[PDB]
Enzyme design. Sequence first.
Site, PDB file in Angstrom:
ATOM      1  N   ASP E 135      49.048  84.474  68.550  1.00  7.06           N
ATOM      2  CA  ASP E 135      50.532  84.176  68.175  1.00  7.06           C
ATOM      3  C   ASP E 135      50.774  83.758  66.625  1.00  7.06           C
ATOM      4  O   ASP E 135      51.305  82.486  66.333  1.00  7.06           O
ATOM      5  CB  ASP E 135      50.969  83.463  69.413  1.00  7.06           C
ATOM      6  N   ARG E 139      56.475  80.604  61.884  1.00  7.90           N
ATOM      7  CA  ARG E 139      56.749  79.481  62.619  1.00  7.90           C
ATOM      8  C   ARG E 139      55.713  78.465  62.970  1.00  7.90           C
ATOM      9  O   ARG E 139      55.785  77.234  63.365  1.00  7.90           O
ATOM     10  CB  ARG E 139      57.828  79.510  63.811  1.00  7.90           C
ATOM     11  N   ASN E 140      54.350  79.103  62.986  1.00  6.89           N
ATOM     12  CA  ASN E 140      52.991  78.686  63.543  1.00  6.89           C
ATOM     13  C   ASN E 140      52.342  78.179  62.249  1.00  6.89           C
ATOM     14  O   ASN E 140      50.934  77.932  62.384  1.00  6.89           O
ATOM     15  CB  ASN E 140      52.573  79.435  64.477  1.00  6.89           C
ATOM     16  N   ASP E 153      48.091  75.549  64.176  1.00  2.18           N
ATOM     17  CA  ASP E 153      47.584  75.948  65.679  1.00  2.18           C
ATOM     18  C   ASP E 153      48.358  75.554  66.721  1.00  2.18           C
ATOM     19  O   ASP E 153      49.578  75.240  66.867  1.00  2.18           O
ATOM     20  CB  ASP E 153      45.898  76.000  65.611  1.00  2.18           C
TER      21      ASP E 153
HETATM   22  O1  LIG Z   1      53.494  67.904  60.201  1.00  2.97           O
HETATM   23  C1  LIG Z   1      53.631  68.640  61.124  1.00  2.97           C
HETATM   24  N1  LIG Z   1      54.811  69.427  61.291  1.00  2.97           N
HETATM   25  C2  LIG Z   1      56.164  68.992  60.953  1.00  2.97           C
HETATM   26  C3  LIG Z   1      56.337  68.245  59.791  1.00  2.97           C
HETATM   27  C4  LIG Z   1      57.829  67.968  59.199  1.00  2.97           C
HETATM   28  C5  LIG Z   1      58.646  68.527  59.803  1.00  2.97           C
HETATM   29  N2  LIG Z   1      60.113  68.350  59.203  1.00  2.97           N
HETATM   30  C6  LIG Z   1      59.963  68.015  57.923  1.00  2.97           C
HETATM   31  C7  LIG Z   1      61.490  67.576  57.394  1.00  2.97           C
HETATM   32  O2  LIG Z   1      62.522  68.546  57.720  1.00  2.97           O
HETATM   33  C8  LIG Z   1      62.356  68.813  59.202  1.00  2.97           C
HETATM   34  C9  LIG Z   1      61.220  69.158  59.722  1.00  2.97           C
HETATM   35  C10 LIG Z   1      58.527  69.271  61.240  1.00  2.97           C
HETATM   36  C11 LIG Z   1      57.254  69.368  61.546  1.00  2.97           C
HETATM   37  N3  LIG Z   1      57.227  70.238  62.504  1.00  2.97           N
HETATM   38  C12 LIG Z   1      57.344  69.664  64.327  1.00  2.97           C
HETATM   39  C13 LIG Z   1      56.796  70.427  65.215  1.00  2.97           C
HETATM   40  O3  LIG Z   1      57.132  71.642  65.260  1.00  2.97           O
HETATM   41  C14 LIG Z   1      56.329  72.064  64.150  1.00  2.97           C
HETATM   42  C15 LIG Z   1      56.840  71.789  62.720  1.00  2.97           C
HETATM   43  C16 LIG Z   1      52.549  68.936  62.277  1.00  2.97           C
HETATM   44  C17 LIG Z   1      51.385  68.848  61.523  1.00  2.97           C
HETATM   45  C18 LIG Z   1      50.250  69.070  62.669  1.00  2.97           C
HETATM   46  C19 LIG Z   1      50.544  69.775  63.824  1.00  2.97           C
HETATM   47  C20 LIG Z   1      51.746  69.905  64.488  1.00  2.97           C
HETATM   48  O4  LIG Z   1      52.171  70.620  65.512  1.00  2.97           O
HETATM   49  C21 LIG Z   1      52.647  71.762  65.402  1.00  2.97           C
HETATM   50  C22 LIG Z   1      52.252  72.846  64.630  1.00  2.97           C
HETATM   51  C23 LIG Z   1      53.229  73.987  64.499  1.00  2.97           C
HETATM   52  C24 LIG Z   1      53.926  73.942  65.595  1.00  2.97           C
HETATM   53  C25 LIG Z   1      54.309  73.165  66.422  1.00  2.97           C
HETATM   54  C26 LIG Z   1      53.600  71.853  66.394  1.00  2.97           C
HETATM   55  C27 LIG Z   1      52.876  69.512  63.194  1.00  2.97           C
END
Ligand SMILES: O=C(Nc1ccc(N2CCOCC2)cc1N1CCOCC1)c1cccc(Oc2ccccc2)c1
Lengths: 268, 268, 274, 271, 271, 274
Positions: E135, E139-140, E153
């Site tokens: 996948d 987006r990932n 991941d």
């Molecule tokens: O730091 C992480 N992710 C993150 C950081 C920042 C932000 N915002 C920054 C400011 O503007 C709005 C968005 C959003 C995410 N996400 C949330 C979950 O959806 C994946 C994007 C992060 C770090 C490690 C693992 C992790 O888990 C995931 C990774 C990919 C997809 C879903 C969850 C997220």
Amino acid sequence: ACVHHIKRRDIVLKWELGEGAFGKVFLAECHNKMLVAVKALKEASESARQDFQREAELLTMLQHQHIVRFFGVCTEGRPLLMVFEYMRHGDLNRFLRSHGPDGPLGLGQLLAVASQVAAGMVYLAGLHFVHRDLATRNCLVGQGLVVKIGDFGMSRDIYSTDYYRVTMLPIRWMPPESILYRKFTTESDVWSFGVVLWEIFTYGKQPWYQLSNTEAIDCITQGRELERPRACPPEVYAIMRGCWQREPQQRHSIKDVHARLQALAQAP
Amino acid sequence: ACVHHIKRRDIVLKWELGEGAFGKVFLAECHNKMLVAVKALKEASESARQDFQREAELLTMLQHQHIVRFFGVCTEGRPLLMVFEYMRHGDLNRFLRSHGPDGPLGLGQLLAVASQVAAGMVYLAGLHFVHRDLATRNCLVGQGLVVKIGDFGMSRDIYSTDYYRVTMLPIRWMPPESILYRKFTTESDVWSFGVVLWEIFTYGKQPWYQLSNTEAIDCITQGRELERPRACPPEVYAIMRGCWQREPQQRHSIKDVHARLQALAQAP
Amino acid sequence: ACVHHIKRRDIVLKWELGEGAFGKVFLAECHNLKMLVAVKALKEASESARQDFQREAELLTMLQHQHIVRFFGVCTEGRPLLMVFEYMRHGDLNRFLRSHGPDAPGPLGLGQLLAVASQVAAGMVYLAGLHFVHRDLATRNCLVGQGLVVKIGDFGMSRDIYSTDYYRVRTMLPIRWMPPESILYRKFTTESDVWSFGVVLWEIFTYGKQPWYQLSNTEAIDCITQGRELERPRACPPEVYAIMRGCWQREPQQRHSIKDVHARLQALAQAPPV
Amino acid sequence: DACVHHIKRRDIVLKWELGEGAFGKVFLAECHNQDKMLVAVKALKEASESARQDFQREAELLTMLQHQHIVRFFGVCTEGRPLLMVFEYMRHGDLNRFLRSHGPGPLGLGQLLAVASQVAAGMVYLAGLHFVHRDLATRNCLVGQGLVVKIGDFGMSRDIYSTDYYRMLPIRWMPPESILYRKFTTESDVWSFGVVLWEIFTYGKQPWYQLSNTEAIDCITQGRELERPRACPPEVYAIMRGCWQREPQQRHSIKDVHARLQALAQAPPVY
Amino acid sequence: DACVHHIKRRDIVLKWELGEGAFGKVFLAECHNQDKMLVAVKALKEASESARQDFQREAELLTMLQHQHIVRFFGVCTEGRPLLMVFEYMRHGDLNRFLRSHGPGPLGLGQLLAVASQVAAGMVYLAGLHFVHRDLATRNCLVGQGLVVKIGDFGMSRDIYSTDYYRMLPIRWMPPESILYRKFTTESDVWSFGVVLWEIFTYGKQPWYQLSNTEAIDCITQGRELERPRACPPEVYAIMRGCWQREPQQRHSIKDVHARLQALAQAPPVY
Amino acid sequence: ACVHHIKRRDIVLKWELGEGAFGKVFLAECHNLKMLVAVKALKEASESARQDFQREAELLTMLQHQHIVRFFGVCTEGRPLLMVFEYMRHGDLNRFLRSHGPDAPGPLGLGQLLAVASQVAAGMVYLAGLHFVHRDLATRNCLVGQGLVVKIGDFGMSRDIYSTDYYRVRTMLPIRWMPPESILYRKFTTESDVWSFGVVLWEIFTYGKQPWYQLSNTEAIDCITQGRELERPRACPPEVYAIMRGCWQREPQQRHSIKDVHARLQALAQAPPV
Ligand SMILES: O=C(Nc1ccc(N2CCOCC2)cc1N1CCOCC1)c1cccc(Oc2ccccc2)c1
Ligand SMILES: O=C(Nc1ccc(N2CCOCC2)cc1N1CCOCC1)c1cccc(Oc2ccccc2)c1
Ligand SMILES: O=C(Nc1ccc(N2CCOCC2)cc1N1CCOCC1)c1cccc(Oc2ccccc2)c1
Ligand SMILES: O=C(Nc1ccc(N2CCOCC2)cc1N1CCOCC1)c1cccc(Oc2ccccc2)c1
Ligand SMILES: O=C(Nc1ccc(N2CCOCC2)cc1N1CCOCC1)c1cccc(Oc2ccccc2)c1
Ligand SMILES: O=C(Nc1ccc(N2CCOCC2)cc1N1CCOCC1)c1cccc(Oc2ccccc2)c1
Ligand SMILES: [Zn+2]
Ligand SMILES: [Zn+2]
Ligand SMILES: [Zn+2]
Ligand SMILES: [Zn+2]
Ligand SMILES: [Zn+2]
Ligand SMILES: [Zn+2]
């Protein structure tokens, strides 16, 4: 109860017929009054108990005019009991040795024996059930020269030199692929029935008695057949040759061996 | 903790070196920073876990200049990990095939290989420890043409045709008694080391490649030796003949094979 | 912690020294505690066997003597179970007496034969003082090191290796080494062990022959229970033979004490020769 | 366990103790279900788990045995305490205590042979089954109405008949190979039947009564046979000597011994 | 389990939710023990036994992975509820949401190549380990300070980016053999990396956006490739077409793709 | 008692009829209930397998139809697990169509071919009415008895015996018999089974050829998902082919109902021939 259970109380031991490392076998009277044979297993670890349940679970279902009859089992305490029909004259190897020029037997009687074992083997083969140690020790003989297959028992203890260490393997009765590749089939059983046919017509000599277990193998493997016996028609020794094909596929069906034998046994 | 435990956290996987039906093996870096090989077993039934504990319990104790080094184990979750020294050039069979007229290797280098494996086998034999599947696939090769025995792994999957069904048995490396009687000793291992000595001096052909598994056996059993290789001194092919004695007792000690080889490897 | 535990990883096997149904025995390296040892490894290991093995470590961890083989520890952390001991380079005294007898150097001196018997007797005094009873004293069950240090090397797997020295019942008993009360009644005491010691003293002075080697196990019994005492060896002075007789009295009460046996063997050891 | 025969405790009425031991008491009792009849009841109050399993083991075995000359066993109850085993009641008790009673009115040669024959018969059955008794003596035989004699397999003989053992083995009933090599076979039993024969024809003397347990052993092993009783015809002493061959293999079968004894019993010799 | 790296809950302070799903929430938080620093915390409140074992499984695996371009994982806590996984915080979030933001100021060709190169690098590591992602999409992937891009991941993408699946498989990221024969290999991933490349150079369009989920499948399988973006040099479209060979075996290695992309990134072509 | 239990002792095996990784199948005698039966015996028998086996008995003990193979009972009293069924003397319809086709008597009549299809359709109407979904309808999985009675002979061990009819994923799926939504989406419904029936109707009219036998499993998929419909057999009248098309519509909603399929096949069956 799905498997047939005989009550200990309904059994009376009369004497011992045979002994092993796991089992004993007795003549006894069963009430509800008849005679029987009782395999008493006194070495009863759960591994062994379960094996014994599994064995009874199977025999309960088998039924043939030339498969020694199984009346049932009792795991109600100790020792574990399996009950069969009594075969009055014992194992065929001792029987042949009795009733041979050490009078002897009518060639019709030697043919009726061979025939009657072949029947039993016809039943197992249609079940695609592989026996893996057929021999005259593992057949039994009852009143009226009835012969049947008395599956295994503890023959490995009793008839000791017939096998060899590694497991104990009846090498003198095994084709090369069973020896070399360790494959056991219907086709290897026919081969062993050829060796049985020999035993019957030598009134029960050990195959390659002259030879020892490790040289016995170099013979079977190097493709040397066993000599035609004195008491043996070449017709019959044709049947043996037809069991001994090196190639399991080119060996006869036990069904056809059984027909030729039953044909001869009527009309020698 | 009596066996050496490596923490998962102290490992970083770098890439995959090899694959099987039970295991994978990776190159990784170990902290407290060095490279290593990690047998990851992901097929982790309790039967298999216990086996894996038993295996680590043993290797923890073994230690020889020509036995691939065992750093330790972690059964802390999944997959189960065993850690060894990294051998940069892999399994010897692929190594020989690389570095042969498909330049080649100095006869001193082919002798250093043979020698270095014989050492490893000298260690196992003094321990009365029988390996049961020695081959160039089951040895490993590191920087500076260091060779060691890389016990088993999952070679039965990788090098598939080298074995045969029944169990999977390395028939092309086994003496007749191992084949026929199923006996595995020190003496059968020497025999296999003769076959190894062949592999090295053919730069890693399958024994009897011309022939298939079922005819291969009729050869080994009928006592036909393997041809002297082009790249092979008759001195050396004397060593092979001295491994291949039909009779396990009349075969050389691996100690003596090891001395003659180490003598030649200095002074060819 | 109570019993001393050696770590598996602190062991490197070097090679096999001996083999049995129950045990193998290796020469190893032992790190910390680098020095050499002998490791008893039992790959049998039911729980009845695993317990017996812990029980024996629990006992051996408290014994200590100039002439009881030294015990360093045990690890029950997995399979095979491990018991670590001092390495005695020249192995079991029986194989050693046979090595170094009429069968240079040449055969041991009388003084060395005496030095050997004194050292066994020494080990056996310690056991009697703990009112501990060996039940299988024999040269096969003493061990021999560098410069002729001798010690009692307890069980092991003696019944497999020196199999013809024992007889069946399914217990296997060292009939040739046993007095009448131990054969007949199965009474094993300090006094039965002194008997056995006499038989050891005979082994020593015959460079390790099986007592009644010309007799089968059953006629060996007959001869023992009947009263018949083993011949004085050709190598055996009559002072020493008197010792054996001392140990072979039929009435346990009337037999000598190992403590006395041991002072006479030490006396003779120091005395100048003929 | 409908398989072994169960007796209900409620269907027992205890009448009086016949005997007593370290593991058992035995009582005469009445059994309901023949609306009523007498039995002997072995009652074990020791009753560990180890000792309850052996009791259900012994009963599982005894259930299957049946013979005119093995104490008939009616069944068992392990529904609570004490554990019960129920046997036929034998009115005259052990054959040793019976032989002392009925000796110097004394018993006819014909009767003593019947007794010897009846025990021998029981021993034929056990040998048949390749089953070793290990402790055959007149005290471990019982006697019913009409001089019926049978073997009374388990009980507490070592407690009652205390001096007949040494610490505990019936050394006066044992051959040299049992004493010396701890070997028990149908051959060592035959040896003991030999002694049993002695006991019958001495109206219940202890063999070597005049010797102590230690010096008894010494005569047994040294080769010395027991003396021909006054009451014992030379044909019968032949039978005793047949059973007393030092060589187990050279000792008569129980089956011959029984056949002679049964013949002589119906057609005794003059003496 | 000192082996995997454990973080103590007390050493976390939740600051705010970044995201939300059916199995997770993710929060920005501060980690004590560098006295302080930001992390992202995956918190699972579902928390069956089945789902706690998979969480300790995933963590056991992630513990061992390490790469400049795989989202760094700091450790785990299964001392109670919710179950925690702690990762490095990537400030700009998923690369899809980052690409829409930073497109028609728009990103330099040089930067888009860096992005493609950085993802490709992560995919080289997984292929190295013979580890199939199944996948891979923008987006990932996550984006840090200094346009660092890594693969992110696990998480709850199927909940957020809902329409990019069908009932649930990322059919727009999947080759014909994945769709038709359910086959996922390092070859099917390369295919998906091809699409990822498309996504970068379209500043985050959904592939076949103009088509529905059903008729998307029909174009994928019928052989029809995606169109060369306006922003995409013909050298880069070659790379996309290399990854889109119908024959898995005829498709470029990730290792070559990564090597080209990394070269072009440092030394782009004119367009 | 709830599910019917046959006693092992009321079974005599006569011989083997069929074989598989999971199951064997014997012809037996069944006492009480003497009459002949087929016994499914599973010597696999983990607990996951032992449960599935009880679950299936629990379902089959409630089904009953002129054209669903009759289920008599089950015994889980030990190993191997047993499931007892009516004996259908001429076995699986595929091997039967192949036996009795151009490869006297001679090849089945059209009327017999129709009688065969009607009887399968009949069984399949019962399942659809229970909103039960077979998922592996195929002539290998219908059974044939005395005088051409045909019935649905459920699973068994079809994936071992007719191994090339399925394709891997580690699920093994009867790709050749599956419509697009069942391949692509894995949606199995009554409508997917009607599709499969069409494919059965083709098997019947080709005396049991594998659909797309000239194509591998992967190009077999291509042809199915692309829309390509199997050729009208040489033996197949165009009324019958219309039926197959009826079952092969791409939109599940648009496909015919087995109930309709079944009335047309019964109509044709009774109609006089050309
Ligand atoms: O730091 C992480 N992710 C993150 C950081 C920042 C932000 N915002 C920054 C400011 O503007 C709005 C968005 C959003 C995410 N996400 C949330 C979950 O959806 C994946 C994007 C992060 C770090 C490690 C693992 C992790 O888990 C995931 C990774 C990919 C997809 C879903 C969850 C997220
Ligand atoms: O009827 C059975 N067997 C028999 C019957 C009678 C006799 N004797 C009667 C008197 O003259 C001597 C022979 C001997 C046996 N045996 C004992 C077991 O060893 C096989 C010879 C019998 C019945 C069922 C099972 C059974 O177990 C077997 C079967 C074959 C081989 C071994 C045990 C034995
Ligand atoms: O160091 C080890 N093995 C290795 C090192 C390097 C390489 N490549 C390096 C690059 O060019 C190709 C060869 C390959 C292997 N393998 C993988 C496992 O199959 C045996 C060849 C190693 C170390 C310890 C254990 C271990 O497991 C074995 C050992 C023998 C056979 C199979 C697995 C492997
Ligand atoms: O160090 C020990 N023993 C030894 C040393 C050396 C040797 N070989 C040296 C070279 O020429 C042959 C003999 C043999 C033994 N063994 C083997 C096991 O049988 C006890 C003799 C040793 C030390 C402590 C305990 C121990 O276990 C025993 C001891 C006696 C008997 C059985 C087990 C062995
Ligand atoms: O009926 C049994 N035995 C008996 C009958 C009656 C008598 N008396 C009759 C009147 O004058 C006094 C003696 C004594 C016994 N015993 C008690 C236990 O010591 C064995 C003699 C009997 C029946 C079955 C089993 C049983 O248990 C035994 C058997 C032998 C030895 C010990 C216990 C006893
Ligand atoms: O009676 C049944 N089946 C049968 C009858 C007869 C025969 N032979 C007759 C002689 O010429 C060859 C065929 C074969 C079967 N089999 C074997 C198992 O494969 C299903 C066909 C039968 C009855 C009920 C259930 C059952 O289990 C099945 C059914 C279909 C497929 C798999 C298992 C079999
Ligand atoms: Zn019962
Ligand atoms: Zn760990
Ligand atoms: Zn330890
Ligand atoms: Zn009760
Ligand atoms: Zn925690
Ligand atoms: Zn049942």
